[PDB]
Design a protein around this ligand. Sequence first.
Ligand SMILES: *C(=O)/C=C/c1ccc(O)cc1
Length: 124
Amino acid sequence: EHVAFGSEDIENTLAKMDDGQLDGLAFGAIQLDGDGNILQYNAAEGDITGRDPKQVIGKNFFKDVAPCTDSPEFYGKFKEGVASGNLNTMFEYTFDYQETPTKVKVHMKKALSGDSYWVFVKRV
Ligand SMILES: *C(=O)/C=C/c1ccc(O)cc1
């Protein structure tokens, strides 16, 4: 899939993408509900993090999969952007739960329709 990380219209291009098309992206992509439960999780993300994309869908990202993100700097921004019903934040972060510490760039952005949220990830 020909989509760049950070692109201005990313929520339109990825809108309603199926799991197979999401696996074609150059960067990691996760879709969460407003509680943080994982709806979609692509192959590029699994290659970065080690998680198995099939097994994590349905788990809670903040409570279960990614406790290192349960902090004001990641989860706090997520829950505030959900609450305003609007979210568009980009920041670097380190993933270090049961893995070699890996620094990434994270982009969280509200998905176009409904009440869903994207978490995009690439290495830095
Ligand atoms: C910290 O616990 C980070 C964990 C993590 C980040 C991103 C993922 O896709 C999976 C786990």
